[PDB]
Short mmCIF file of C-alpha atoms (C1' of nucleotides) in Angstrom, two decimals:
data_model
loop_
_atom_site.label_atom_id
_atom_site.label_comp_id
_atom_site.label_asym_id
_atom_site.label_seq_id
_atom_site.Cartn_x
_atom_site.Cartn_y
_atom_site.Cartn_z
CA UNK Q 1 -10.20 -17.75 13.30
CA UNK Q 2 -9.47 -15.59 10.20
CA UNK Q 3 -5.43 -14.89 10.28
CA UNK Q 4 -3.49 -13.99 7.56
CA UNK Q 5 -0.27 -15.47 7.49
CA UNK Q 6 2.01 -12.69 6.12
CA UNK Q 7 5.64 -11.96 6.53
CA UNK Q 8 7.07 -8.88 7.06
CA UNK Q 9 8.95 -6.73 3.90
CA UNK Q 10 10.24 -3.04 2.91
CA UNK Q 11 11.31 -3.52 -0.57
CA UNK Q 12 7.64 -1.44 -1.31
CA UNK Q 13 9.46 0.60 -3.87
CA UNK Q 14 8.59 -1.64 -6.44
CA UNK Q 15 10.89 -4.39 -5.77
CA UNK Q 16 8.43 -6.18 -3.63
CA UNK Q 17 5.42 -5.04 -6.22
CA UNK Q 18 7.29 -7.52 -8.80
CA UNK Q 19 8.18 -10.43 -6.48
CA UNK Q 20 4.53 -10.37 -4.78
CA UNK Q 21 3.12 -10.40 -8.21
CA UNK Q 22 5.77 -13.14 -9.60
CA UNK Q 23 4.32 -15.58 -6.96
CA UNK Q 24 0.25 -14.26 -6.56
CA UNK Q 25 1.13 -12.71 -3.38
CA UNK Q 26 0.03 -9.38 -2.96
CA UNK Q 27 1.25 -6.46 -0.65
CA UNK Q 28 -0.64 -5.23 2.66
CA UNK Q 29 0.29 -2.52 5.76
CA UNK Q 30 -0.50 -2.66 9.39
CA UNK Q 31 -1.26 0.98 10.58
CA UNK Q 32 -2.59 3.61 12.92
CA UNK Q 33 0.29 2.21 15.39
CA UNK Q 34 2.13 5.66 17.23
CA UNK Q 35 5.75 5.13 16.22
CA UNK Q 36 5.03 3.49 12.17
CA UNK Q 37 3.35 0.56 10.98
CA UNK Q 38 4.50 -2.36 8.98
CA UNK Q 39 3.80 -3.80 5.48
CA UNK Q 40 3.37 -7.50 5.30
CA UNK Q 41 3.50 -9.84 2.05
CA UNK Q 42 0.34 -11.95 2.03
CA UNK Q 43 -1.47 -14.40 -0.38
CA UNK Q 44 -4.04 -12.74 -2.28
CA UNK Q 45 -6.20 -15.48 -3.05
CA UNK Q 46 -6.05 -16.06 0.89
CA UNK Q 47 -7.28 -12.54 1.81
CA UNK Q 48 -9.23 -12.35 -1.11
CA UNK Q 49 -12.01 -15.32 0.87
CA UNK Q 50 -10.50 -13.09 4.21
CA UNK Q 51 -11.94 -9.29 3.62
CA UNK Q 52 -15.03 -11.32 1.14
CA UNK Q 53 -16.70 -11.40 4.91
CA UNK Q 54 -17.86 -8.92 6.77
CA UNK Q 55 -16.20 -10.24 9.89
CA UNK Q 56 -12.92 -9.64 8.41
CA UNK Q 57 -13.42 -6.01 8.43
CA UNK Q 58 -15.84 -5.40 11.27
CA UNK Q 59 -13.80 -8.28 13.48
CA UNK Q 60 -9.81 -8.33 14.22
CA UNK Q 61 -7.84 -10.72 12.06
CA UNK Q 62 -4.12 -12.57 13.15
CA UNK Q 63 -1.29 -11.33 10.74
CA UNK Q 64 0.80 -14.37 11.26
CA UNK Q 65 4.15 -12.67 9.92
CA UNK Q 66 6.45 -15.76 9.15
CA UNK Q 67 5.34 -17.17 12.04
CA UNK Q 68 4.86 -13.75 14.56
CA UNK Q 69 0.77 -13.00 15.22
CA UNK Q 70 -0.36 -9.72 15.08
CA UNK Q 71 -3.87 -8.38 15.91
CA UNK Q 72 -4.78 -6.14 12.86
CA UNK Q 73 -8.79 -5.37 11.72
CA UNK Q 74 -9.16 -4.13 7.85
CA UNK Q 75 -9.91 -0.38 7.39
CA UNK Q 76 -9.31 -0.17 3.42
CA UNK Q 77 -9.51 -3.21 1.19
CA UNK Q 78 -8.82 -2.10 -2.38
CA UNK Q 79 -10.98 -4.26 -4.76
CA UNK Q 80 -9.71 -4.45 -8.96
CA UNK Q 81 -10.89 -1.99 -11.18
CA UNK Q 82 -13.36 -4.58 -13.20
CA UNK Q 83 -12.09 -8.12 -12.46
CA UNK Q 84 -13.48 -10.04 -9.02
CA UNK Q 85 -9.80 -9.39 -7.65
CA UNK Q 86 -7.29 -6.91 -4.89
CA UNK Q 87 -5.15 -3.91 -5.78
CA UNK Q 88 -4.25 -3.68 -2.35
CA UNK Q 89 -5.25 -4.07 1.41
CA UNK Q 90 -4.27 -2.34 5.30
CA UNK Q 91 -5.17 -3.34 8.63
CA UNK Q 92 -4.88 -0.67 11.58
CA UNK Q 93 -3.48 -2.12 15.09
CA UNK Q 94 -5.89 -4.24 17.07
"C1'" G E 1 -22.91 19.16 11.80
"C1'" G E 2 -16.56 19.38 15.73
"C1'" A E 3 -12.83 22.14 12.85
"C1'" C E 4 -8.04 22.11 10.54
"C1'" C E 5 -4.00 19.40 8.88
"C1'" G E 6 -2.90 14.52 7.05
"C1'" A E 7 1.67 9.84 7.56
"C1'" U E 8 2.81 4.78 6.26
"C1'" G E 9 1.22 1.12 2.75
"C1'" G E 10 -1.49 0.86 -1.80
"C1'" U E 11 -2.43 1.50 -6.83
"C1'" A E 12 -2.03 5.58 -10.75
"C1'" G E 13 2.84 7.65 -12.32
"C1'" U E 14 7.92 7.79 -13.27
"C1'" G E 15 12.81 6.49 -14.35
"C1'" U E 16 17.90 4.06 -14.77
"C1'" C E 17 21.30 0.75 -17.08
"C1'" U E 18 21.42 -0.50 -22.31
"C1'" U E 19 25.62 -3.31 -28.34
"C1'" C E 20 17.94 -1.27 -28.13
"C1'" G E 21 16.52 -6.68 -27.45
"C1'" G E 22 16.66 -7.40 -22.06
"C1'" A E 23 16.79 -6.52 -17.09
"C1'" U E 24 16.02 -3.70 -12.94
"C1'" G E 25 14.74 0.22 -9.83
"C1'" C E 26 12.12 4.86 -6.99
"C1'" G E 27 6.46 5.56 -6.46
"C1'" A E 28 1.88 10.05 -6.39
"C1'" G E 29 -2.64 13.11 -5.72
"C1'" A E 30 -6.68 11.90 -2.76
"C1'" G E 31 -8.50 8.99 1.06
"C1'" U E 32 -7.34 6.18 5.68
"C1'" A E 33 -4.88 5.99 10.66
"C1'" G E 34 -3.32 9.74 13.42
"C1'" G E 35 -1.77 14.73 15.05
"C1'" U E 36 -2.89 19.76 16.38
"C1'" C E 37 -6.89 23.53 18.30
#
RNA sequence: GGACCGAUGGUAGUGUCUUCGGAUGCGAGAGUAGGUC
């Protein structure tokens, strides 16, 4: 199985965009719920070998949030502009 | 070749504090997911 062990965060605002960078982690949201969804921080070098198979998109992955599984499937990986890298990633709600 | 509208999260962008060096925020538009008819 895929799963991307995450853990849950808010600071979105840019606070988490300098603490996810500052350690090669690398933001991500779990949408399409009802009520809202939920951003996760994630390793990007992880879901970098995750959403680099088709599986990862076309199959449901397992957002283990510090330690909480969620069923997510990716709907809009962001790759870099040149580089072979992320600028950002969502699941919606398996 | 359903139509219309279109969040959160993203990156683009933008401050604030400040002995000006340093530190630290908030974050589009468009698309997606969904809603409405």
């Amino acid at each position: 199985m895929f799963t991307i062990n995450a853990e849950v965060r808010k600071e979105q605002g840019k606070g988490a965009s300098r603490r996810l960078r500052a350690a090669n982690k690398f933001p991500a949201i779990i949408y399409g719920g009802k009520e809202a969804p939920l951003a996760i921080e994630l390793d990007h070098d992880k879901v970098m070998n995750m959403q680099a198979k088709a599986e990862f998109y076309s199959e449901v992955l397992t957002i283990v949030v510090d330690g909480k599984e969620i069923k997510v499937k990716a709907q809009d990986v962001q790759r870099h502009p040149y580089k072979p890298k992320l600028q950002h990633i969502d699941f919606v709600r398996a």
